[PDB]
Design a protein around this ligand. Structure first.
Ligand SMILES: Nc1nc2c(ncn2[C@@H]2O[C@H](COP(=O)(O)OP(=O)(O)OP(=O)(O)O)[C@@H](O)[C@H]2O)c(=O)[nH]1
Ligand SMILES: Nc1nc2c(ncn2[C@@H]2O[C@H](COP(=O)(O)OP(=O)(O)OP(=O)(O)O)[C@@H](O)[C@H]2O)c(=O)[nH]1
Ligand SMILES: Nc1nc2c(ncn2[C@@H]2O[C@H](COP(=O)(O)OP(=O)(O)O)[C@@H](O)[C@H]2O)c(=O)[nH]1
Ligand SMILES: Nc1nc2c(ncn2[C@@H]2O[C@H](COP(=O)(O)OP(=O)(O)O)[C@@H](O)[C@H]2O)c(=O)[nH]1
Lengths: 50, 128, 430, 431, 431, 430
């Protein structure tokens, strides 16, 4: 295959969907919300440990 | 090669202190703050700002300058100061300004001497 | 009765228009197709007999991609199909291309549609022209359109929300060239020009909204919020109503000096909200903070000439008076000697609506501070040397000459910007 | 709706064009039979830039294949995507040019050029709006360089305002395939300087180095190099074919890139090129793409940019990305490597963003650099040309096909003048 | 309606501040989510001294957290009351000060001090009337000591008239944690003498002694020491927050404690600290509280007051108590221990009474003693500083941050002069 | 945010890196495939979008065998294939071969990969260079790499965990030669050099773990445990955190004096485990035992300048303070008169993880004692006569000369080591 063509199961790989999405702000907002929730959960776990 | 370090410890440069005429000129000029340490008190550029304001009231305003220790605010003060110096015709050396913002020993002393020459009737500092 | 005609020129203009019209539809409850389940929409929308509301806007571009994105997006049934105007060839960052060769037929059709739009307005507060200073479409075509508007409409207030190049960060190379050309063009045509810098708005998004990767959509959302706050007095009632005509009379000390710094407050994410009081005094202080400026121009460098404040939400004249008195007593903020008051406060009872999916939180109070201050000469000082540094070698000058420009035009634009620098220095000096 | 006419010249040009059309058909979801099986609206939104609609759902590429020997076109037609091209667009002669620029430009290129221009005119008049032409061919070959320069001159005469983009495979520094490569290159560069609006230099040895070091491909076929070239050729125009957050067409790139009309040669590179072993290990971020992009080994031209000075550089990014992140990365690159950037241009970067990345890649970025480093490549070509021309070796073939000897001198003088301009702007100081 | 702006500096300062805010929230019935759950009018009566009301019923502490490394305030946010603080008030760098006063005061402290002062000003202007600022931090640490002293200087410049309160954890006499504790302490004391209006000294070893001997705890972690510090820090300002039979604010305490501006260092202690076993056997009476109060074991400072002379001493009592009982106890203490009290002040005790005792404790009392005993602490720190400075060990770290060697000598001279003044008033005779 | 880049040069560097990365994978739960079933791994691993964690490490060697062993072993899917950098010809125990002729292209590629690694780190606490002083690759190429890192990166703290030749036992013949050369090289480049000796670690393994046949895997496991204890404060929270910048500040009195003895405790097998109390005081005493030194250098001969204690597990500040007070009251432990404190205690709440298949037991408490003391001059004194004994006859000198060296290089290295001896004598003296 084409060397430029990424292999499956790679950080570079994206399906045909998630390509042509053309939505950056929504993805960043969703990732920000997920990171905030994960950070709150981590703080809760550390609080429980302390 | 012979070294003068204490196991790699290089003592600070220990530059000579300001000239008495420069200190007297600064003291006679009305300033809110005082020259305790030349390096520390001139690095921010606020004292230079007050001196330039006293010599040129309309050109230099105290509000444009901020008394902050940050590199950003120090650079803003010194850059607007250099812009006014270039516009007026006063020679403010960029190397001395950079040494002053970085707290290089003697840079602020030389800068104060240069300003005292530019302003106080070119009364050349008594050297040698 | 209080209609305002919106013009969006170039990719930047159309992309901020998307955010603006999304915000207006959300604020007035108008669904994206056009109809909603009094007469507060009349400023931005004209209703048809069927009940569907069509905006009084014109999307102008020489590149088909940006306009076709709107034609295919959610707002395909809202805007008028002929109101969306598409070119065939892009201006290619060329002021001459957008002003002399490609822009002619496009601007003729644009004036035709603008005639049709104004004929449907009983009153007309003015035009809100959103273009891109630093691109051939925005600069050249926008300048030509502004000149034609000044010729035919005459005394109608044209408020140009222009985007100038940032000091260090940029995306184009001939950006100083076409920026200088467009600034020379619009010095004499726009009534109030508002400067906007992508670097400053990026810093605002990074620091205030905690967005480590801000984008054009976020920038346009902030700009749209500013414009909605600016127009709120036209659509929603409140004490101390302020008008488009009053913006000049309280902001433009002299005809040449009409460039404006803009700042919105508060800019806080949902997480950071409901942790601070967000009082009127605090939001006014935040608006007067130099970091909150949407222009990479530190206002401490100059002196404020006029400051027009648009308050939205639960704001009382008591609080605005106290906050403005504290601002006047502040030593860091300095006003010119010849303007004792220099303040134009206007309150509105409608809180700023929040766009779902955005980062701005639901805040019950908001401030839009638009100021004339002489510090704005600094950005012109930056562009004036960025221009002449390139102009010394005549780099990219043949590109501009090929579409019917002359070296005399470059010389005239540079001299006019130097004269603008001189005027700013003069009005700043006692 | 801004159409582009593709032209392939010579064996190398035909192979590269076939690979490029395969890549574009894959990216737009077109099967080798031409039917749309792409499963996306945006793919068909701007398919008219490269393709035309046939009777049914078939899409015919707007490509014109030109050659003097039918073998390369027969191989291309028998290849996987040989059936999409319209058979009338295959213009071939009967006796190939024996690596002779004179045969490809004066004797044998003269007869076939009428048919070639006929096909070009038929393709161009069908276009609603024409951005211009892109010609892929190889310097240092007879038919390729010959009719490439000839057709470029003719199309410049017919359509002066329309864009000209060229992908020329300049003969490689160390390994040379044919003997008369310096002669052909010297004759062709002189034509490209006058005619081509925008010229893209590719070297087979630079391609071998990049695919052996970054891709870690050990025995790379010509197909691999052609496919890298195809990726670059797609990425240069993806802003025309797909919606972009900050789009930039070919004319915008040319305006932002070319400071002076004669300095229109560029070195290009593609990101992210990853070896198969490290594909899971590499994480794609805009800083990573820029770090790989500004690397000298990433350039597909043999000249390394470190020796020269970047006059200008455009980067077309592709994918859902932060404009702040991109702009900050490019500004930081400029600040860190200010020694390598020309001083009298405050911003040497034209950044463009398209929202549609290529197939398989989350993000990509194609780079186009105008730097004075191309001086050393033209210098080497002149070093070989002068050595051969002093003793007039192999000159008699070009003489017997009917050009004066003075043409060689004029071409060498023009190339030397171009080298002089590049050096002048390399060592030019502000104020 | 007299507000206090709390600032935490360094790892130790941040941990102490988090414990203090937890204790204050417990005292005012505030849950970690910010809502009030106290069921007592007096708790909300003066909650504005420390807290601000958000859009809802939430209460946010008027606290500002400082650091050069983000890990410490990540731990703070993970702490039990990490969620009350406003997220904007967390001001952090990226590289911590490596126990370097020069790094925390000049190089790395310079950039972050903008944000620190901006947040301080934003919090201060919102205050209707401002009693002052209180900074909790540890002498002998890079970011803590350096940034705290720099901020205290800036706040003294901006608000000279407003009260300045410092809770500094001076390095312990016997067991030292870091090697450069004497340098950091010497450089911090010079700043605190000039800038801080009121400063209180805490020692980790003294707190260990008190929690091992009085509380009889077997494994006291840093949490217990921060708990005692929080108790003292609350008890000093409980008169602002609660009605008092004879109330006394921070400025009144400073006026009645500080005879001369440079002699503003105080040792503090809290009563009643009772071991869990002897809680039943001990009877809560004002004489018992005073007996524990004046015991040299109760001081949280290493220096024992027996060696020095009490220049002044303020005692803030809390609970239902007799003013006659308290006053007679203080007078009897003065008469019995007149040798330990300075002669040229007729009354060396400032007694204050508050009606609101801490939850669970029927009565309590906090002690703030200005005595010449702190002289021996400064003397020991100078003994270490001179020993290290004679051979100039670890001096290169401070020199490489742009600190003159002259500054160390200036700080040492200031500290020695402070010692000299303490000795002068220890051996000063009336008439 | 606390990223630390690991460099492993030569056979010993790679072989201790294998143990180090096995230990880190076990500590953070990272399976050998690369991914685990927060953000504590960021110090040693960078995560990709796929979820797989890759170490920020660089295996540098001029011999292919050691690197191919890693490429073939269990951790073939863990390490970055290009980060494994392999030469074609070995340095043949020749400092000149590894520093002047063969090392050039290898160090160029190593700097390229190191730049790529550092570009992926937000913060950068420093570099952890693991080499083998006494072999051409580790000495020569390691010295060249350290010099280039000093030139380009500058002030980033480089901690070199060097392995000097043991006093009596050794495996090479030109080991004194290339050891002296590399010592002259790294006296002026590394920030803190941690000293290790195979003889002392063999002593530890035989006496403490009761291994009658210690091997390199055991030695590397001990070294890995020590480095994990040193870096534990970066990855796991606890009272009295210690930072990479803090080691140099509280451990280096003067730039020349930055060589450190290292000792781990407890070193007990599972058989002997749970058979003693293993209190904080006892493990501190064990750490201060002269036998527990990993360098055959009796600390009784010299005087301690500084001692950094790193506690792992169930450790309480009261206990560390009591133990350190006992150590200070102890007479045999002697400090310099100009360092009254001389102690830097730091605790971590994460107990040391146990490597399956290793001999170390699961202990709830651990101490890593890293000390600057003047006794370390003794090992330089041994190498200084081992060097000149051969140098008088110029034995094996032609080998070094053949690869682009001179008699002057040897003379300068010997004089520099003599100067280091004199400096240690002077700092020890009052
Ligand atoms: N703030 C902001 N600025 C934008 C945005 N989009 C584009 N710009 C700016 O707009 C400038 C160019 O805009 P345009 O002239 O309209 O680009 P175009 O549509 O391709 O037209 P030409 O460049 O003239 O050929 C760039 O320099 C950007 O800085 C946006 O979404 N937000
Ligand atoms: N502690 C320890 N030392 C080792 C280990 N392996 C090798 N060494 C030491 O490393 C020294 C040589 O290492 P290297 O220079 O890397 O050997 P190399 O990889 O063949 O490279 P050159 O010898 O320079 O050619 C020997 O003298 C050993 O004492 C190990 O596993 N643990
Ligand atoms: N990258 C690439 N280069 C090629 C290919 N085929 C030929 N070349 C190179 O192109 C150069 C010119 O050959 P070419 O112009 O195709 O020969 P011509 O058709 O007879 O003129 C030769 O030196 C080849 O090395 C190919 O498929 N890909
Ligand atoms: N009372 C108390 N002292 C602490 C705590 N944490 C650290 N310390 C002490 O504070 C001193 C200085 O450390 P610190 O200033 O916080 O380090 P920095 O944050 O890097 O400046 C050390 O000697 C520690 O012994 C704590 O939680 N409570």
């Amino acid at each position: 295959g084409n060397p430029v063509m990424p292999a499956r199961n790679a950080p570079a790989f994206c399906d045909e969907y998630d390509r042509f999405n053309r939505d950056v702000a929504g993805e960043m907002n969703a990732k920000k919300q997920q990171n905030l929730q994960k950070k709150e959960e981590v703080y809760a776990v550390k609080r429980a440990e302390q | 090669q012979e070294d003068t370090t204490l196991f790699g410890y290089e003592s600070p440069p220990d530059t000579p202190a300001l000239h008495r005429d420069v200190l007297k000129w600064v003291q006679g000029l009305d300033l809110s703050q005082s020259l305790k340490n030349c390096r520390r008190d001139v690095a921010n550029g606020f004292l230079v700002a007050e001196i330039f304001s006293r010599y040129f009231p309309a050109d230099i305003q105290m509000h444009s300058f901020a008394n902050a220790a940050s590199s950003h605010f120090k650079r803003d003060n010194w850059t607007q100061l250099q812009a006014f110096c270039g516009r007026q015709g006063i020679n403010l050396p960029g190397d001395l300004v950079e040494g002053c913002v970085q707290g290089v020993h003697g840079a602020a002393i030389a800068l104060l001497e240069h300003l005292y020459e530019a302003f106080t009737g070119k009364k050349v500092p008594r050297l040698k | 009765m209080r209609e305002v005609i919106s013009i969006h020129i170039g990719q930047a203009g159309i992309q901020v228009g998307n955010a603006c019209w999304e915000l207006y539809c959300l604020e007035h409850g108008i669904q994206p197709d056009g109809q909603m389940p009094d007469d507060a929409f009349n400023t931005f929308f004209s209703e048809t007999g069927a009940g569907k509301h069509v905006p009084r806007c014109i999307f102008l571009d020489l590149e088909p991609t940006v306009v076709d994105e709107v034609r295919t997006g959610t707002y395909r049934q809202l805007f008028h199909p002929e109101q969306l105007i598409s070119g065939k060839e892009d201006a290619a960052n060329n002021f001459a291309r957008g002003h002399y060769t490609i822009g002619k037929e496009i601007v003729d059709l644009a004036l035709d549609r603008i005639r049709k739009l104004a004929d449907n307005c009983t009153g007309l507060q003015g035009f809100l022209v959103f273009n891109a200073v630093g691109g051939g479409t925005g600069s050249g075509l926008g300048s030509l359109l502004l000149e034609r508007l000044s010729v035919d409409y005459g005394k109608k207030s044209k408020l140009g929300f222009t985007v100038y190049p940032s000091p260090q960060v940029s995306t184009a190379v001939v950006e100083p060239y076409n920026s200088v050309l467009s600034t020379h063009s619009l010095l004499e045509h726009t009534d109030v020009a508002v400067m906007l810098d992508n670097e400053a708005i990026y810093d605002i998004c990074r620091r205030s909204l905690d967005i480590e990767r801000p984008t054009y959509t976020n920038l346009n959302r902030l700009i749209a919020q500013v414009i909605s706050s600016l127009t709120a007095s036209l659509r929603f009632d409140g004490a101390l109503n302020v008008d488009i005509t009053e913006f000049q009379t309280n902001l433009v000390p002299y005809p040449r000096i009409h460039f404006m710094l803009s700042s919105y407050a508060p800019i806080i994410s949902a997480e950071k909200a409901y942790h601070e009081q967000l009082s009127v005094a605090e939001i006014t202080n935040a608006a007067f903070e130099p970091a909150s400026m949407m222009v990479k121009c530190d206002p401490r460098h100059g002196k404020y000439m006029a400051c027009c404040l648009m308050y939205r939400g639960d704001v009382v004249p008591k609080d605005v008076n106290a906050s403005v008195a504290t601002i006047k007593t502040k030593r860091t903020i300095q006003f010119v000697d010849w303007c004792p008051t220099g303040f134009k406060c206007g309150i509105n009872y409608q809180p700023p609506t929040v766009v779902p999916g955005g980062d701005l939180a639901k805040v019950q109070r908001a401030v839009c501070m638009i100021s004339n201050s002489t510090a704005i000469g600094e950005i012109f000082s930056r562009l004036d040397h960025k221009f002449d540094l390139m102009y010394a070698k005549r780099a990219f000058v043949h590109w501009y000459v090929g579409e019917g420009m002359e070296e005399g035009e470059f010389s005239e634009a540079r001299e006019d910007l130097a004269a603008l620098e001189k005027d700013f220095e003069e009005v700043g000096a006692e | 709706m801004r159409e582009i006419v593709h032209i392939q010249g010579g064996q190398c040009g035909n192979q590269i064009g076939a690979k490029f059309w395969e890549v574009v058909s894959d990216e737009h979801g077109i099967d080798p039979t031409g039917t749309y099986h792409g499963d996306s609206d945006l793919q068909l939104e701007r398919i008219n830039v490269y393709f035309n609609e046939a009777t049914g759902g078939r899409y015919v590429p707007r490509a014109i294949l030109m050659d003097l020997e039918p073998g390369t076109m027969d191989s291309v037609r028998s290849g996987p995507y040989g059936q999409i091209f319209r058979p009338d667009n295959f213009v071939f002669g009967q006796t190939g040019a024996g690596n002779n620029w004179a045969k490809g430009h004066y004797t044998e290129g003269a007869e076939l050029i009428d048919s070639v221009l006929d096909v070009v005119r038929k393709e161009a008049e069908s276009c609603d709006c024409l951005q211009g032409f892109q010609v892929c061919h190889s310097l240092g070959g007879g038919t390729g360089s010959g009719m490439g320069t000839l057709l470029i001159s003719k199309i410049r005469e017919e359509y002066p305002d329309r864009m000209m983009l060229t992908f020329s495979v300049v003969p490689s520094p160390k390994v040379s395939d044919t003997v008369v490569e310096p002669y052909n290159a010297t004759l062709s560069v002189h034509q490209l300087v006058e005619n081509a609006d925008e010229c893209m230099v590719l070297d087979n040895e630079a391609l071998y180095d990049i695919c052996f070091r970054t891709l870690k491909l050990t025995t790379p076929t010509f197909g691999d190099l052609n496919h890298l070239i195809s990726a670059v050729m797609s990425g240069i125009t993806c802003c025309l074919r797909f919606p972009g957050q900050l789009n930039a067409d070919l004319r915008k790139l040319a305006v932002n890139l070319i400071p002076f009309p004669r300095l229109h040669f560029f070195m290009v590179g593609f990101t992210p090129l990853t070896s198969r072993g490290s594909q899971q290990y590499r994480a794609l971020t805009v800083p990573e793409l820029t770090q790989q992009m500004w690397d000298a080994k990433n350039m597909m031209c043999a000249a390394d940019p470190r020796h020269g000075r970047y006059l200008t550089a455009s980067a077309l990014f592709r994918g859902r990305m932060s404009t702040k992140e991109v702009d900050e990365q490019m500004l930081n690159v400029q600040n860190k490597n200010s020694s390598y950037f020309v001083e009298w241009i405050p911003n040497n970067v034209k950044s463009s963003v398209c929202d549609i990345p290529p197939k398989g890649l989350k993000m990509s970025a194609t780079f186009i650099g105008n730097s004075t480093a191309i001086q050393e490549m033209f210098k080497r070509v002149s070093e070989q040309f002068t050595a051969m021309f002093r003793r007039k070796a192999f000159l008699h073939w070009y003489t017997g096909e009917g050009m004066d000897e003075m043409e060689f001198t004029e071409a060498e003088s023009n190339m030397n003048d171009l080298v002089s301009e590049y050096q002048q702007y390399q060592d030019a100081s502000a104020e």
